[PDB]
């Protein structure tokens, strides 16, 4: 009969497994207390008060312990008489994070060791009728691969040291087990080593026949038809036939399709087939490239004892190729949707959370709709994190935002040892089999930055020169084999339309990493290494931006959200602990980054308004250059979208989901009609008209030289065509040309775009750092006035730069935001909050540059 389903989600209880030291230390968690599943026990601890929130101020260290502690869940549960007569009986874990051993009414029932595998057990013979009792262990990573570790020839390359001291430097155990790398702590973020049943238990039964999947396998889309095969994975228990319908709906929800397949299924695994071909297809596009239209295949199965179940999928349809051809820069890099070069705009994508089982669906829809609302149209889910949610994917296709998936390698040196390598390859399995319907999901990846760490890292370089040759070549070996052929053969056998990708940087394995001429770049000598002027920004342009960045502080209400008022300095203990670049000491280079452009903030407040607008500059130069590229460069994914906790980080978006000034900026550098004007080292301006539209572009474009006084000093106008899908230089102008004899501290140049009489873009330009400038005094009033919302009018009597709306702890949402003003033209942002517009009023705080630049500090000592 039919199959049944029953969630364990009930009454769950944990402690730590007695016997251990932290049992006398913490009586509280040697007792039981309530667990939710999903869950971590992390969060379990913090429910029960028995550990402060390790988010507020500097908490971090005081829930260490549990990463280092084995953990015993319970749950009962019921079976009732019809259950235990049914053929099959199985207990189905969706998640177990991550070393476990399961006990069903005492007796062995399952070992797990992946936090990202599925666990099917027969429980049949096990389970009686009335109670039952589930037990779980799970096994602290730490705790179990160190003694093992402790005791090898060497330790592999991995992440990052613990803070806490409590595993050896550059002996990590988060190399050897699969799970979440950012769990044991990144630069961005704190180490939290989760333990927990972290997504659904469940008890199915079933009798003739387990419907395991539908996958529509697309075979070839164009304009003229997609030809597509429905295709059902049947689990049988014993022979017998079976009879598939399938209903087709098209976007607009009507019939297009109805099919029916007969089949005789036999024991074990079965697949049944339906072609299906689709005339003048609706297909599927990515955000500003047209409709994310979506059909929804619906099959139903009757199996030989005349029950039905049903199946759905929601398919998009359409074609991609990765593009890589010979041309005049090396070898080209580009993502090629329904037969259109993609321009790639976006920014890499980490876990949503610390704690991922918490996550909500609003958290994950809004996550996208920021990446939406910024004119972004990819997303790389980058390998140190966890695969997401199904509702998350969901959301994308709806959307419209691509997916760069990595598979969840985040830089270690992975072992070679085959049973490694086949529990990964299970895990990719499951993965793919469970995405690969998902329209936005069009690039899998195998890893983030193994092999370029592996030829430009010093630690790496050392190591494996230290070794015997012997030995590097079964490591070298080994991370072949598991990035170049297992990932690569998954995605070949299950999601065949998709291009697979061996590592990011690189060039799939045909040679080096990090090439500017072939395959993609994570570019961090801005930042990182050298900590090189954002300029240099210019002098960079690969085939592809995968990654790069700056930092800055999360927004204001964010930073009150986990520092008290006598914590506000960035050098305070709470603020280092929320600071996680380059161990702790990272002020120091968010300070280098600030003072070059700003000098020395005067306040903090100021402080983390100057370290949003310099993170924002730096990436808008950046991002722009790449897109003026075009089709030098394909691709600008900028580290990082989003962030795991409060904290300093590359993001645009805190982790309330606040929206940083960068975000704002980026929605402009990002939009579909650009321009760029774009002054470097050497005092050359160059200017560049971008267009993504997929007609010409009928345009005209102005520049404006003018004094901080609001004298115009020279103005210029011209015609341009812009061709589909092109970028079009249409100027370089020396400082000399530009200012010609005038103060370059006391002019700035204006650059806008124009269709018709329809303002595009606009670029406001300056020949010296702010820090030199001799900006005016801007007098900014504000007219309010009730809409939906409400409108804000914003009008200087003078130039006012990056000028900052908020409104202290209110919650208020702006359209618009980390904006210039112009002398006398009014900008008006639609402001959405439940407060009374009289409360609004009182709120508003309004900052820009100039006033932000007056009367700061020397740079220090």
């Given at each position: 009969s039919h199959m049944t389903a029953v969630t364990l989600d009930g009454g769950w209880r944990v402690r730590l497994v007695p016997g251990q030291e932290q049992g006398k230390t913490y009586p509280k968690a040697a007792a039981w207390l309530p667990a939710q599943v999903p869950g971590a026990v992390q969060t379990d601890l913090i429910a029960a008060k028995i550990v402060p929130d390790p988010f507020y101020r500097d908490n971090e260290g005081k829930i260490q312990w549990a990463g280092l502690s084995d953990w015993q869940y319970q749950t009962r549960f019921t079976v009732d008489a019809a259950t235990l007569k049914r053929e099959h009986v199985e207990l189905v874990f969706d998640g177990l994070d991550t070393f476990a051993e399961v006990t069903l009414n005492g007796k062995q029932l399952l070992s797990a060791d992946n936090m990202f595998r599925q666990w099917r057990v027969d429980a049949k013979s096990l389970l009686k009728r009335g109670d039952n009792l589930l037990e779980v262990k799970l096994y602290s990573p730490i705790k179990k691969i160190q003694p093992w570790l402790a005791k090898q020839p060497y330790a592999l390359p991995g992440a990052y040291d613990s803070a806490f001291g409590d595993e050896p430097e550059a002996r990590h155990s988060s190399t050897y087990v699969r799970k979440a790398p950012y769990n044991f702590g990144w630069d961005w973020g704190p180490r939290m080593v989760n333990a927990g049943i972290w997504k659904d238990v469940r008890v199915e039964a079933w009798d003739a026949v387990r419907v395991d999947g539908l996958h529509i396998a697309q075979q070839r889309v164009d304009a003229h038809s997609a030809q597509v095969q429905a295709q059902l994975d049947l689990q049988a228990g014993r022979s017998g036939p079976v009879q598939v319908t399938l209903d087709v709906l098209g976007p607009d929800g009507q019939k297009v399709g109805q099919f029916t397949q007969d089949a005789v299924v036999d024991p074990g695994q079965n697949r049944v087939d339906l072609a299906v071909r689709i005339a003048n297809p609706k297909r599927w596009f990515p955000a500003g490239y047209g409709a994310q239209d979506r059909y929804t295949f619906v099959a139903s199965v009757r199996d030989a004892d005349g029950d039905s179940q049903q199946i759905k999928r929601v398919t998009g349809l359409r074609s991609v190729e990765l593009r890589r051809e010979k041309d005049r820069f090396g070898k080209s890099m580009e993502i090629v949707i329904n037969g259109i070069p993609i321009f790639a705009k976006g920014a890499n994508l980490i876990p949503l959370d610390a704690f991922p089982a918490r996550v909500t669906h609003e958290r994950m829809r809004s996550t996208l709709q920021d990446a939406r609302d910024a004119n972004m149209n990819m997303l790389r889910m980058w390998g140190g994190g966890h695969y997401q949610d199904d509702y998350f994917y969901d959301v994308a296709d709806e959307l419209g935002i691509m997916i760069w998936q990595?598979?969840?390698?985040?830089?270690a040196v992975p072992p070679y040892d085959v049973e490694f390598r086949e529990n990964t390859r299970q895990e990719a399995i499951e993965q793919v089999k469970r995405l690969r319907d998902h329209p936005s999901l069009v690039l899998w990846c195998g890893n983030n930055e193994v092999q370029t760490g592996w030829e430009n890292w010093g630690d790496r370089v050392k190591f494996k020169q230290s070794v015997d040759p012997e030995e590097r070549t079964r490591i070298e070996r080994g991370m072949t084999t598991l990035f170049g052929t297992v990932f690569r053969e998954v995605v070949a056998t299950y999601d065949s339309d998709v291009p697979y990708w061996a590592t990011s940087p690189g060039t799939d394995f045909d040679g080096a990493a990090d090439q500017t001429n072939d395959g993609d770049m994570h570019y961090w000598k801005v930042w990182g290494g050298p900590a090189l002027p954002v300029t240099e920004y210019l002098n960079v342009t690969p085939r592809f931006m995968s990654e790069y960045g700056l930092q800055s502080f999360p927004d204001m209400r964010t930073v009150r959200a986990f520092a008290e008022?006598?914590?506000?300095?960035?050098?305070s203990p709470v603020m280092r602990v929320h600071q996680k670049f380059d161990k702790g000491n990272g002020n120091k280079r968010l300070m280098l980054y600030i003072r070059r452009e700003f000098g020395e903030p005067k306040d903090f407040e100021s402080f983390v308004y100057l370290s949003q607008l310099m993170q924002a500059e730096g990436i808008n130069i950046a991002a722009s250059h790449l897109r003026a590229s075009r089709p030098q460069s394909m691709g600008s994914l900028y580290w990082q979208l989003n962030d795991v906790w409060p904290g300093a980080s590359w993001s645009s978006v805190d982790y309330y989901g606040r929206w940083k000034a960068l975000h704002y900026h980026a929605r402009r550098f990002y939009a579909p009609e650009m321009i760029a004007a774009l002054r470097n080292d050497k005092g050359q301006t160059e200017v560049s008209l971008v267009s993504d539209r997929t007609t010409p572009l009928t345009a005209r474009w102005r520049m404006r030289v003018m004094g901080?006084?609001?004298?115009?000093l020279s103005k210029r106008e011209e015609k341009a065509s812009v061709n589909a899908l092109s970028s079009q230089h249409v100027g370089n102008f020396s400082d000399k040309q530009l200012l010609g004899s005038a103060d370059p501290k006391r002019t700035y140049a204006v650059f806008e775009l124009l269709d018709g009489d329809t303002l595009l873009s606009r670029e406001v330009v300056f020949f010296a750092p702010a820090k030199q400038l001799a900006l005016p005094a801007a007098k900014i009033d504000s007219q309010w006035r009730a809409d939906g919302g409400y409108a804000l009018t914003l009008t200087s009597d003078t130039l006012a730069r990056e000028v900052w709306l908020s409104f202290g702890d209110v919650d208020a949402t702006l359209s618009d935001n980390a904006f210039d003003l112009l002398p006398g033209e009014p900008l008006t942002v639609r402001v959405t909050s439940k407060a009374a517009l009289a409360q609004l009023q009182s709120a508003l705080q309004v900052r820009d540059l100039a006033a932000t630049l007056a009367g700061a500090p020397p740079e220090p000592q």
């Open positions: 990595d598979f969840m390698f985040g830089g008022p006598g914590d506000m300095d960035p050098e901080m006084d609001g004298k115009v």
